[PDB]
């Protein structure tokens, strides 16, 4: 949409990747 409402920028995407890691780190330990 707009850049200035998306602020800013790369630590928000990185804090999206850590639950993407997390949804495998949380589901592996259930299987262990």
């Amino acid at each position: 949409s707009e850049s200035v409402t998306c602020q800013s920028f790369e630590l928000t995407l990185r804090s999206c990747l850590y639950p993407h890691i997390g949804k495998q780190y949380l589901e592996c330990c259930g299987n262990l």
Partner: peptide
């Protein structure tokens, strides 16, 4: 799921 995590990051960029 390599670019899939980055595709959801770009999808979150358009929804932020």
């Amino acid at each position: 799921a390599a670019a899939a995590a980055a595709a959801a990051a770009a999808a979150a960029a358009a929804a932020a």
